[PDB]
């Protein structure tokens, strides 16, 4: 959607192309221009090898999704950031269940029949020492040899009390202390495989700056495998989280269902831009075009043409993982 191969007589299609086109007719310059595609049709092209093809002057200008990093500003010149972007962390949402099954969960279904069964068979032992007739034993078992039955039966209930607590704690802690991420610092230390997109600076920014092993970062080709690397989770060869720029991620939420949510804020907020030939005087020409293209609101009107996909779908909104005992557990 942002920039793409096309069969049309311009040759390319997208959003950044039509931002680039709508800046040309603001300039007083009749500019002849061509469009040369760069990479293969199998994966993304390496954008450090796109900007390398502007330093070596094979292309006078790289128009696309080129992101301002502090080597890329050093070797070429950029325009002003016409759109804002930041690396986020997308991850699966919290599916916290709620049921009366979640109530009776800390014992096995056979254990709820053995325990309820060995209160009546022990309750039938009271009849040996002793519908409306059967309720007479409950008036006698409120608080010889039958007292010795009550002593052992006391220490049974002082264990089924003292184990049902220990298996409702051991669910309500492991539900909290499972493999979780709520920030980029959670994702650095918890040594799970991280997905990225192929051909980006995000591969060589996490390695260079965030100190992440190269074996954790897993490349990924297209937007169908951006789901199959999260439906499988951290196991089965998939990855825990995908780290992409913000305008890529606001496409992925709408394109999929409401099962993912950006668990953090942007931890590197830079923006996009056009990559020119270094110290070319067109950069001062189109920086004045874009800052006049933005203030007239045309930079927003083009955004509704292609990137109209935006649905919030507040599954979870920075939810506090705390006590939160389930409403249907006491239904």
């Amino acid at each position: 959607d942002y920039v793409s191969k096309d069969k049309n007589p311009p040759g390319v299609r997208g959003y950044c192309i039509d931002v680039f086109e709508a800046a040309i007719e603001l300039l007083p310059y009749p500019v002849p221009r061509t469009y040369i595609l760069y990479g293969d049709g199998k994966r993304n092209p390496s954008y450090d090898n796109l900007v390398n093809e502007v330093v070596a002057d094979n292309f006078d200008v790289a128009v696309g999704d080129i992101t301002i990093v502090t080597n890329r500003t050093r070797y070429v010149d950029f325009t002003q950031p016409f759109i804002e972007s930041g690396l986020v962390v997308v991850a699966p949402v919290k599916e916290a269940k709620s049921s009366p099954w979640s109530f009776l969960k800390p014992f096995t279904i056979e254990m709820w029949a053995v325990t309820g069964g060995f209160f009546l068979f022990v309750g039938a032992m009271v009849w040996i020492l002793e519908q409306l007739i059967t309720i007479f034993w409950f008036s006698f078992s409120t608080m010889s040899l039958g007292r010795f039955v009550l002593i052992i039966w006391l220490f049974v209930v002082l264990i089924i009390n003292s184990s049902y607590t220990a298996s409702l704690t051991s669910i309500l802690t492991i539900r909290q202390l499972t493999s979780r991420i709520e920030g980029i610092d959670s994702l650095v230390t918890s040594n799970e495989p991280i997905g990225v997109q192929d051909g980006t600076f995000a591969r060589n920014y996490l390695i260079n700056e965030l100190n992440i092993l190269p074996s954790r970062i897993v490349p990924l080709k297209d937007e169908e495998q951006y789901l199959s690397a999260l439906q499988r989770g951290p196991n089965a060869g998939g990855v825990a989280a995908i780290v992409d720029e913000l305008p890529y991620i606001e496409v992925l939420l709408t394109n999929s269902n409401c099962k993912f949510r950006t668990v953090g804020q942007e931890f590197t907020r830079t923006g996009w831009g056009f990559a020119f030939q270094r110290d070319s005087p067109l950069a001062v020409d189109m920086s004045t075009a874009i800052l006049q293209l933005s203030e007239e609101g045309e930079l927003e009107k083009i955004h509704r043409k292609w990137l109209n996909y935006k649905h919030e779908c507040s599954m979870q909104i920075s939810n506090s993982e705390d006590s939160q005992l389930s409403l249907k557990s006491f239904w």
């Binding site: 040996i128 040899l145 039958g146 039955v149 052992i152």
Partner: peptide, 27 residues
């Protein structure tokens, strides 16, 4: 294992009750 103590203690009191029934027959 905890239900084994439910079995040993309750079956002990059947024998004390049956010895009481055997002494009930002694009257």
């Amino acid at each position: 294992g905890l239900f084994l103590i439910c079995g040993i203690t309750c079956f002990m009191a059947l024998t004390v009750f049956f010895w009481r029934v055997f002494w009930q027959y002694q009257r």
